[PDB]
Design a protein around this ligand. Structure first.
Ligand SMILES: N#C[C@@H](c1ccccc1)N1CCOCC1
Ligand SMILES: N#C[C@H](c1ccccc1)N1CCOCC1
Ligand SMILES: N#C[C@H](c1ccccc1)N1CCOCC1
Lengths: 545, 544, 545
């Protein structure tokens, strides 16, 4: 069918939308933009087309294999009270007279409506269910991207999605996909996995495969196959009936409605803003790709999947032959409706493989031993931190990034230094902040950062010191490019923060001592001190813990 | 959405379409025409429109109750062997190099292609499945109907439809609509049920509701709802998959390709020529009508549904209040996408209510006792009868009409006397013949008719004798209109046929003795001597 | 025993080998390639391996039956003069100071040497006879093939083989194998056999069986048994004594000597370039398959064998039951050391069965009567055709293909038109040409094709006109893939050649009249224009008539 059809009504904004940035961090303010509903039209062009999908014997085998694992999963029905407790406090309110705050409180009004929505789900497996369609606001750096289209149903239905399916998507993918299921690895765990599966090959080749607007390429067929996988589980028969109802009334497709209530058209592909999107996209991506591997006769593949993001490490057969089999892979995926964005290429050096906008690099600890850590190009993190420090938002990428990339040269020198300067100047070190980790919202005290980092990365995160050349150049140019002070300047700033932190004692002094030992010259001795976080992807799924 | 979209390509025939008749039976040959593909555009016009559909609590309540019943129903997957055996010997061949004969014979080629269609049905629940669109050649009398459009898929698909849904459509409607499922009634049992439910009311009113081109009014929503009722059954897991997939790729709509292989357009409404049409149409009618009854506050409603055909008998609230309530019933049925053709009218006389082109009337048996029988206007039967005698057709509507209308003045005196005459004059009494009964093709030996008619109608079918005045006139009027000899001539022809038959002894002598006892003058004292009326299968490509 | 063992010395070329085309016929010149010695190593990997062979009662029953049939056969020794006459004029020279030209001229130096090779064969039944190993230069279209490994003995030995065994391989296979011996059929007779035996089954099923590099799977045992089948015949005493010597000293194996005189290794399987290779392979293949049929319990098997190529046609026992008996069949062939390449599949459509790279299809003649004929995918003949026009070969596969496939849509419109146009351009219509029919080399005058075709295929061949949808589409997509112009262009090109041919009168007129009556619109009433070619197979046996 067609991924989308449009009525003509605009995708409309909920309020203002600031396209630009109103400085101690970065001087080239004109390189940072937010996407807006103004670029919506362009996105609608890039994301709408017909979908011709040709399956083959490889697709069916993998699927059979996947169904066999899915059949050993038992999963439970979440109560109204449990599914309420999972809704964020600022989730988008219902059009039926209650908000997320009512839900969280178990108000008998919300709860009665949730009951009613579930009962209709049980009673009617046909009528499409309404979604809202909005354009995302994300900050990026110049050299432009159109806004991405978020699509999601009413809060009533989302609490119902939780009840039917939260336990399935928290549990199944890991079993179905084993070590290929990305969202079970902390950053350190993901480096240990990739590094070890690299050295396990006689002669390793790796590639990341970029799919071209993946949610568009997900066919309604893909989504029923995904349902049959869910249905293999040992389910309660009432969950079984809402999982059917949901996939046919919501996941497969539906109408699109803008913020002003007008009808914008119709979707017959993946909505980003529903509970099954991460799990669904992950499964679908691993299915097609496993098959593409088999089609291209690739040797001893190990895969790692996170939603629409795929990496494959395998046994090379030579540069000529690798490059050719990679094009055979690409056809396989195309035939499966997962065509290429940037066409994929063989890498023979782990460091240069990018997956989940991240890559492996090495550095050394206090004792000199080489340590491998996860990193990324810091442009977007810096840009967003700049945006975050200028315009107050209730979402904190900087903090997520400090947690996720704590060992990195840039997170420690720039991000840690910068914001600990702000919190200290504003007397708000104590105050909890909300950050995203695998699409899930957690409330986090910035003063706990030392424990958190020790726990996810070991003490070495506090003492890494001979970063690789290619990493050091990456960061330096990013800094020159953005107009952020060179690294010598942040060392001097960090010493200032470290000292101010130490004078406050306790948790505050432990941040200074640990997060900033890299800046002192004479190091102190850093000793041990004294998480269902890295288990499953929930991005798009309206989750809070 | 639009029931049909047309590309502009014509609807094409396979062959020569006779339209006019090329005299024993009727003399006014120019009154009888046969529909052809020349009339198709006029039909295309009538059957293509937008459907605005809107449901309410009544609809929804009735659906809940319907599902509850379906849930009590086990149904099983037919094997390829069982499904092959159900295929008519003369069913349109597959475009994949085999025919019904190959199917019927378990040709491993036919069987292996069926296995391949089944497997694709399982992997793929979205790609529309190709149908072929044809204009129907039906025969009529004047005062002019344009051809109906038959729409159907390839034989491979059809066998898969049987594997998946033959047990459901043969079993689900009766459980779900109890006394309303019309196809559980032989013609004698249909009459009994109408008469008793009429007599059981304190003060009865009735109406039949003519839906304007029902097939086109069936929305893609209606067809999915039907699919969801089926799924309430306890079904094998491979059946469940083949049903959804069949409904999404076939039932719900898909491309229309003519006989020359060109795209005519796209369908988003009921297909006339699939296994589920009768069942679907019946359920979908029962659902809309049951709720419409509630919307109109109809007291003590009893209903009879045969696909798109509907009859309601209920308690009267007074003349005035009935008409008003009928108009409410119509309003509802319109919201639900079943606007009327001829708007419904209240009737206080059962013998004036028409349903499945038929009506109850009354006659008296040997003893004097009054018996109720089903009749109709004989115009179309006599038309097709004459057409069947001039041009050899593989279908025999005369036999079916003798079977379904054995007790009628017109079938007894004309159809029996005419064709038993012809059969005699060609030494073909032994030869089995193919006739349709609730859409299914059965082979029947005409010499068996006495045992069959007794079983289906009773001994009294061989001695009904004081037909109502209205009935006698309709028959006689129609005789004058069509130019077919009056009933006194047929009486004479019958004594002659009866004699010849009596002289052959055997089964032939029993036909003589029983089928034409009406004609003798001095009667003989007549003494005594299946699984046919259980479910509907028009469109379904079915044989036993 | 290892099919081959290798010293390490390479397989080397005689002249320098083209691998690429230097366009009237096809634009996509980079899709056409020739195999060269560059790929000898890739082949070497594929064809060298160990043979576990195990036999059973079914194998023995069938061998017994075979020897009984062969015991009814007489066969005579060929004179030297007879044997010399069968030697093609461009057959590789002897390394004992004479050539094929000398052989054909009955020179006393050649004849004296042939007597001495014979005298030594009679006396010595053990000393392995020298062979020469070479890489074959065959043309193909992409979608890569390593070259095949042609291996052959000295010309002296070859003339001796013809003396001993020519009469035997020309006559024995037929008697032994009966209706199964494939090389006894014209292409039209093969078509009639496949068709009639298909229609002779109540409920038919067929399969072809591809054997993983058959020459390599032939064990020394097989080649000895094969020998013992020959010894059943009534044979002159010296025929017997030479047949044993040849089978122990040359057929069983022996050393491999490259074109430079070095030792490449040693062979313990079938040699492609000896006289008994067609007859042996056909027997061995027939013997194993006949037994496997019985192992699998196939009902009413009708078998057709051409060397390593096998098709079986039998009564279907149902689909699951059919699928299973092939697996049983495959297991048996494997025990017997003839494992599969592509595993066999059941087929219920005669036109979808390929055998000898060919399938049956249907057209209609002058009268509209339906008529059966033999065809193939034209990709490979089109490719070899391109090549034979761009570069001068002494082997004209285009002429082979016109004779073999006169009735075909693609042969008539493209091969006929195209080559008759070139012969016309170059004033060479009168000039005899060498072509290979069943591996025997014939010199054929191209103006004789209208008689040759009438005899071999009937007048229907000159007027077939409603080729099946499947056959039309295969020919169409091949034109596109290969870049050859569409059939409308060949119609017009054919009318031109047809006119020019009619103007010359004589036999040139007759070709234009008949061969091209398809391009004319108003046709001529074609009427009758006023062989020992399809008896046995000699592919590999150095044979000329
Ligand atoms: N940073 C970050 C996370 C991530 C964040 C949000 C959604 C999905 C992933 N990222 C690193 C670990 O592997 C996955 C990619
Ligand atoms: N009542 C009833 C049946 C019937 C038969 C077939 C389809 C629907 C109804 N009856 C009317 C028309 O044909 C024969 C007599
Ligand atoms: N059947 C047959 C022959 C054949 C010829 C030569 C060797 C084996 C088989 N066929 C395919 C290849 O050449 C011409 C047509």
């Amino acid at each position: 069918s067609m991924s989308y059809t449009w009525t003509g009504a605009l995708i409309t904004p909920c309020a203002a939308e600031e396209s630009k940035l109103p400085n101690s961090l970065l001087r080239h303010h004109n390189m940072v933009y937010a996407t807006t509903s103004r670029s919506a039209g362009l996105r609608q062009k890039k994301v709408t087309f017909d979908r011709l999908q040709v399956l083959d014997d490889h697709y069916r085998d993998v699927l059979k294999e996947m169904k066999a694992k899915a059949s050993t999963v038992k999963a439970k029905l979440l109560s109204v009270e449990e599914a309420c407790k999972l809704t964020p406090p600022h989730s988008a309110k219902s059009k039926f007279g209650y908000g997320a705050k009512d839900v969280r409180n178990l108000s008998s009004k919300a709860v009665n409506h949730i009951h009613s929505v579930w009962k209709d789900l049980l009673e009617d497996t046909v009528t499409p269910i309404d979604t809202t369609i909005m354009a995302k606001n994300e900050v990026f750096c110049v050299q432009r991207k159109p806004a991405r289209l978020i699509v999601f149903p009413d809060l009533g239905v989302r609490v119902c999605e939780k009840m039917a399916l939260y336990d399935v998507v928290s549990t199944l993918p890991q079993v179905v996909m084993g070590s290929s299921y990305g969202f079970q690895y902390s950053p350190g765990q993901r480096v240990e996995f990739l590094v070890n599966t690299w050295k396990s090959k006689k002669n390793p080749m790796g590639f990341s495969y970029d799919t071209r607007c993946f949610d568009s390429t997900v066919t309604e067929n893909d989504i029923r196959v995904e349902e049959s996988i869910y249905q293999c589980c040992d389910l309660a028969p009432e969950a079984r009936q809402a999982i059917k109802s949901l996939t046919e009334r919501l996941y497969i497709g539906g109408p699109l409605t803008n913020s002003k209530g007008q009808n914008c058209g119709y979707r017959r592909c993946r909505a980003s803003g529903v509970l099954t999107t991460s799990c669904g996209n992950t499964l679908t991506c691993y299915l097609k790709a496993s098959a593409a591997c088999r089609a291209a006769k690739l040797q001893d593949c190990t895969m790692l999947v996170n939603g629409d993001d795929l990496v494959v490490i395998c046994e090379s057969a030579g540069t000529q032959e690798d490059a050719a089999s990679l094009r055979v892979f690409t056809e396989a995926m195309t035939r499966y409706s997962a065509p290429p964005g940037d066409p994929p290429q063989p890498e023979y050096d782990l460091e240069l493989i990018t997956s989940c906008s991240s890559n492996v690099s090495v550095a050394h600890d206090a004792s000199g031993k080489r340590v491998y850590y996860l990193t990324r190009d810091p442009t977007t993190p810096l840009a967003r931190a700049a945006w975050e420090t200028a315009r107050h938002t209730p979402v904190n990428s900087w903090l997520g990034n400090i947690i996720m990339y704590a060992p990195t040269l840039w997170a420690r020198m720039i991000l840690m230094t910068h914001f600990f300067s702000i919190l200290l100047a504003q007397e708000q070190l104590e105050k909890a902040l909300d950050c995203q980790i695998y699409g899930a919202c957690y409330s986090i005290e910035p003063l706990d950062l030392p424990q958190i980092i020790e726990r996810l990365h070991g003490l070495s995160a506090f003492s890494l010191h001979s970063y690789s050349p290619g990493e050091i150049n990456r960061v330096a140019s990013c800094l020159r490019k953005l107009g952020v002070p060179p690294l010598r300047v942040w060392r001097h700033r960090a010493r200032s923060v470290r000292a101010r932190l130490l004078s406050q004692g306790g948790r505050a002094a432990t941040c200074g001592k640990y997060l900033f030992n890299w800046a002192v010259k004479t190091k102190l001795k850093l000793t041990p001190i004294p998480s269902g976080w890295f288990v499953a992807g929930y991005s798009g799924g309206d989750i809070y813990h």
